């Protein structure tokens, strides 16, 4: 098969939209964020809502309907938190993960940098490679949904190859030319 | 029911299972004879190893892993097992080959430590070492493999060979995990069989092979980023090599490989930036600071980021 990780910054939107699609279509998948904090959209783009990764989805749900029941229903954040609850109790920091993956996919170049920086700085024990791929997905419901379906077609495509390492780059190129989107690609080592 | 009985039963079972599930049962046998009671390892050795012939890729990968652990538990076993390993390195399946490369990455050091710690050395043990040494030679040749995965594993193997076959120096930056790893400087100049100077030359030649690889005009994106990263490690752990690494960076930045696709070019070049910054922080980079800085700036590195990575 293919053990996949999906990674973005807050482990809320894009990365959970992909978690959800991959999980329901039979992939073994985990999702994480890399950002310093968990950020939910707030009253104004300059003042988001900020949490620690220890914080439950359910918790954020009530911290938010304590703020403005109305603002978080209309902007879909409450429905998202409820959807995330059903997958996983709390968001997770990539830098604290200890499990191994075959393929880590990132949803923003900045995160790709954080994943690379993190994996390059760890104790290398084994030299087992893990492939890291980026696709920039804007942070909104629509793009996140679209980006999850694209990530799913990608993994489904990678899973049909006979030899992943030998042909992943040809597939990513096929995918850039079909999708109009660029796919950065690198390897880190365990 | 003892361990030996609990093992005979697990094997009778494994001899009858017709699929990959048999690996579970094999992994349990592994734990029981390598960890929970090594006195039984010899009794059941031939019988685990015979699984090397199984048609299943995964069963074959499990056998290489078992070899790796048996040899860490009792390095003398390498007298027999090195043939099996070299043959599994020549497996028709790329995933078995790649596992073989990773196991050699571990065992080479271990075997060399055993040759060095050994006072008197039998002809057989000498031959065993020649085997290990030539298998390292084979894996170096795997840099010309036509498979991108084999190449990447070959690079990592070659990377560790260069670190192992060169001396730790006062300004070497050494990772916690590899603290107790043999290195050239730990090898007595007057050893009865291991020749300090033959080894020093074999590391130099290994590093020459890698530098040649970097300049293949058909080099793949992933192979190049891997090779870039291995040179950053070598450079930090073995700063007598700083000058060659910087020159390899220089060469790449004049001569960008023209089969790379646009995004591949971007991927590789984001790593070149990262490895230049990581090397700049090393004290032994002093001489070449402006040569590195020219390179970094040319790739659009901003100066708050350049300046965060001085030593």
Curated annotation (Swiss-Prot), chain A:
GO terms for biological process: co-transcriptional mRNA 3'-end processing, cleavage and polyadenylation pathway; termination of RNA polymerase II transcription. It catalyses: O-phospho-L-seryl-[protein] + H2O = L-seryl-[protein] + phosphate; O-phospho-L-threonyl-[protein] + H2O = L-threonyl-[protein] + phosphate. The keyword Transmembrane helix does not apply. It is an enzyme of class 3 (hydrolase). Keywords: Coiled coil, Cytoplasm, Hydrolase, mRNA processing, Nucleus, Protein phosphatase. Changing residue 8 to S: Abolishes phosphatase activity. Its main location: nucleus. Residues 156-182 form a coiled coil. The keyword GTP-binding does not apply. It holds the Pfam family Ssu72. GO terms for cellular component: cytosol; mRNA cleavage and polyadenylation specificity factor complex; nucleoplasm. Its EC number is 3.1.3.16. GO terms for molecular function: RNA polymerase II CTD heptapeptide repeat phosphatase activity. It is found in: Nucleus; Cytoplasm. It comes from the Eukaryota. InterPro entries: RNA_pol_II_suA. Belongs to the SSU72 phosphatase family. Protein phosphatase that catalyzes the dephosphorylation of the C-terminal domain of RNA polymerase II. Plays a role in RNA processing and termination. Plays a role in pre-mRNA polyadenylation via its interaction with SYMPK. Interacts with GTF2B (via C-terminus); this interaction is inhibited by SYMPK. Interacts with RB1. Interacts with CD226. Interacts with SYMPK. This is RNA polymerase II subunit A C-terminal domain phosphatase SSU72.
Swiss-Prot record, chain B:
GO terms for biological process: cell adhesion; mRNA processing; negative regulation of protein binding. Keywords: Cell adhesion, Cell junction, Cell membrane, Cytoplasm, Cytoskeleton, Isopeptide bond, Membrane, mRNA processing, Nucleus, Phosphoprotein, Repeat, Tight junction, Ubl conjugation. It comes from the Eukaryota. Residues 1-95 are annotated as: Interaction with HSF1. In testis, expressed in polar epithelia and Sertoli cells but not in vascular endothelia. The protein is detected in stomach, duodenum, pancreas, liver, fetal brain, carcinomas, lens-forming cells, fibroblasts, lymphocytes, lymphoma cells, erythroleukemia cells but not in endothelium of vessels, epidermis, intercalated disks, Purkinje fiber cells of the heart and lymph node. It is found in: Cytoplasm, Cytoskeleton; Cell junction, Tight junction; Cell membrane; Cell junction. GO terms for cellular component: bicellular tight junction; cytoplasm; cytoskeleton; cytosol; mRNA cleavage and polyadenylation specificity factor complex; nuclear body; nuclear stress granule; nucleoplasm. Its main location: cytoplasm. The keyword ATP-binding does not apply. The keyword Disulfide bond does not apply. HEAT repeats lie at residues 2-35, 38-72, 75-117, 124-163, 198-237. Belongs to the Symplekin family. Could be used as a differentiation marker in the differential diagnosis of tumors. Scaffold protein that functions as a component of a multimolecular complex involved in histone mRNA 3'-end processing. Specific component of the tight junction (TJ) plaque, but might not be an exclusively junctional component. May have a house-keeping rule. Is involved in pre-mRNA polyadenylation. Enhances SSU72 phosphatase activity. Found in a heat-sensitive complex at least composed of several cleavage and polyadenylation specific and cleavage stimulation factors. Interacts with CPSF2, CPSF3 and CSTF2. Interacts (via N-terminus) with HSF1; this interaction is direct and occurs upon heat shock. Interacts with SSU72. The HEAT repeats have been determined based on 3D-structure analysis of the D.melanogaster ortholog and are not detected by sequence-based prediction programs. This is Symplekin. The chain holds residues 30 to 340 of 1274 of the full protein.
